[PDB]
């Protein structure tokens, strides 16, 4: 509790983002662990309730069968508003404690008492922002009572005023705050294709890979050159190369698979769902690779 | 270039769509208005290249806020949402209309405050002036929002010698017989309701549960309306608004017993 350590390896799981859509193709008993987006189950802050009462019974059904992870989106963790005022300590911290989650992931953006302004705003890669965000991440982890990992972000422009690269920023951030890392491999792959000079090899060598608690394997698409990270396409092979490469250099605790929103998830997307085996065969491949490097 | 200054800049751009027309149309250095502060123009000059991504950072902000207009409706007024979807109103045309008046405000986790401003906005829309039954249902839903918001930091009154009205329940005197829609939610906004006033009590079983609707007598509404201020040390039975100076039992005591079970009033313990 005074200083958190990386939990033991717990296995592969699915994100459980589609509430009604994924439980129908639920397969066997090999999942064991699933993720829970804390934003979907949180109640408004101008009310007296912490969790949505409809989601209160759903967590009871699953907390017994499967271990359920926490994910902090739209929490305004690394914003400029006071930490006590942010939705992270007011709703996300008790939700992870209510869920009995071993650790909690957290995206690496900006947020000041507002959600949906978080994306497309990576933290300014500067030693000034390193000191500020590490102080917040170290204090926010104290309130969580559990390890706090930071999910790497995919974007189109880095924040103006960047004094270093993303790998150096994340390395200096978790070293000063003592927090951990959540490695989204498709975000790494997206930044390699759409950014001028994103050294994929230097990125892996610069990160403290012994701080990586969880891994994310997803797949997006693009057609003509506009939008990416749709989190829908089949897990591409370059991302699969990073999954096998990461397991040979460090030892995470879990790995989750992200997929699309049930409706849109962007300005123009699709929602048809007849390729359910496309996901089952992805979870099968990533699960077999884990046993190949199993401790 | 402080990180707090590049954020304040985009918060100003996303809320002022007049500034968006200047940045998108004119990509030349001085063609975009130098009315942007000298510190602002330096940050815009970094975005001089890749202005297409800036035009993609907007719209995305607007698409999410237009969808958030529906979440705020599903969170605060799920019945009003189902009635509005049945009569086929362009909520997208109303999301853009509501958000433009608010300068594309990001309500964030203040979903009940969001919903309360939405229900007040839709109560004046010309598309909804022809549906008074839905207009009545929305005001009922607006009291459910005021029920949750009134429990964030309520004035904690200690249990004492007088009948107290709790903050875990509100009352709404309807204009139509809204019970027909509450008892038959498949007819939400579809069927026709009579113009008979009802006394629906929005209350909460527990502080961590979904709020409920229930109907009470006009006598029970008199018992609740006379407890606005806890002037009720047996004076409540004297306070029938000069219509009755009688202190009764069973006829009025059983109603007070049900109101306590519904967490509406606190008996003098
Ligand atoms: Fe995520
Ligand atoms: Fe991810
Ligand atoms: Fe991703």
TrEMBL record, chain A:
Binding site residues for Fe(3+) 2: 107, 151, 258
Binding site for Fe(3+) 1: 71, 107, 151
Ligand binding (Fe(3+) 3): 151, 184, 216, 258
Annotated residues for binding of Fe(3+) 4: 184, 187, 229, 231, 258
Pfam families: MbnB_TglH_ChrH (PF05114)
GO MF assignments: metal ion binding
Keywords from the named record: Metal-binding
Protein name (Swiss-Prot/TrEMBL): DUF692 family protein
Organism of this sequence: Pseudomonas syringae pv. maculicola str. ES4326
Automatic annotation (TrEMBL), chain B:
Descriptive protein name: Uncharacterized protein
Highest rank taxon of the organism: Bacteria
Species this chain originates from: Pseudomonas syringae pv. maculicola str. ES4326
């Amino acid at each position: 509790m005074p200083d958190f350590v990386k939990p033991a390896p717990i296995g592969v799981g699915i994100q459980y983002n589609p509430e009604i859509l994924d439980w129908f193709p639920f397969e066997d008993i090999q999942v064991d662990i699933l993720e829970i987006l804390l934003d979907n189950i949180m109640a408004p802050m101008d009310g007296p309730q912490i969790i949505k009462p409809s989601a209160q019974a759903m967590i009871e059904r699953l907390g017994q069968k499967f271990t359920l992870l926490a994910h902090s989106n739209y929490g305004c963790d690394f914003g400029f508003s006071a930490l006590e005022e942010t939705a992270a300590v007011q709703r996300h911290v008790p939700l992870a404690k209510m869920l009995n989650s071993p650790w909690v992931a957290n995206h690496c953006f900006y947020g000041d008492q507002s959600w949906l302004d978080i994306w497309s705003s990576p933290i300014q890669f500067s030693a000034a922002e390193v000191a500020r965000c590490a102080d917040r991440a170290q204090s926010l982890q104290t309130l969580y009572g559990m390890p706090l990992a930071h999910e790497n972000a995919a974007y189109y422009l880095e924040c103006p005023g960047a004094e270093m690269r993303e790998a150096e920023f994340l390395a200096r951030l978790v070293q000063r705050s003592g927090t951990f890392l959540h490695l989204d491999l498709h975000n790494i792959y997206t930044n390699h294709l759409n950014l001028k000079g994103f050294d994929l090899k230097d990125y892996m060598d610069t990160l403290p890979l012994d701080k990586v608690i969880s891994v994310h394997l997803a797949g997006g698409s693009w057609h003509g050159g506009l939008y990416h990270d749709w989190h829908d396409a089949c897990v591409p092979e370059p991302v699969w190369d990073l999954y096998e490469d990461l397991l040979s250099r460090a030892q995470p605790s879990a790995v989750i698979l992200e997929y699309q929103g049930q409706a849109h998830h962007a300005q123009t997307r699709i929602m048809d769902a007849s390729d359910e085996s496309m996901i089952v065969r992805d979870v099968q491949r990533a699960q077999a690779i884990w046993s190949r490097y199993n401790r | 270039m402080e990180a707090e200054q590049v954020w304040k800049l985009w918060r100003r751009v996303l809320r002022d769509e007049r500034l968006q027309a200047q940045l998108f149309s004119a990509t030349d250095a001085t063609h975009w208005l130098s009315g942007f502060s000298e510190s602002e123009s330096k940050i815009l000059s970094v975005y001089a290249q890749q202005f297409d991504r800036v035009k993609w950072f907007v719209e995305n902000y607007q698409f999410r806020l237009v969808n958030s207009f529906l979440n705020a409706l599903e969170t605060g007024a799920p019945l009003s949402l189902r009635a509005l979807l049945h009569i086929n109103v362009d909520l997208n045309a109303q999301s853009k209309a509501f958000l433009r008046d608010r300068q594309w405000r990001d309500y964030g986790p203040q979903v009940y405050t969001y919903c309360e401003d939405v229900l007040g906005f839709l109560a004046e829309a010309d598309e909804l002036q022809g549906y008074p039954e839905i207009l009545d249902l929305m005001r009922l839903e607006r009291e459910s929002v005021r029920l949750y918001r009134g429990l964030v930091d309520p004035e904690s009154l200690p249990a004492d010698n007088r009948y107290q009205r709790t903050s875990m329940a509100r009352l709404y005197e309807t204009r139509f017989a809204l019970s027909g829609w509450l008892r038959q939610k498949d007819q939400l906004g579809l069927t026709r309701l009579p113009e008979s006033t009802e006394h629906v009590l929005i209350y909460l079983p527990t502080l961590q549960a979904r709020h409920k609707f229930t109907l009470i007598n006009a006598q029970a509404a008199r018992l609740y309306n006379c407890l606005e201020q806890p002037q009720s040390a047996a004076g409540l039975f004297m306070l029938i608004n000069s219509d009755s100076a009688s202190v009764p039992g069973s006829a009025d005591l059983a109603l007070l017993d049900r109101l306590e079970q519904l967490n509406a009033i606190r008996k003098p313990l």
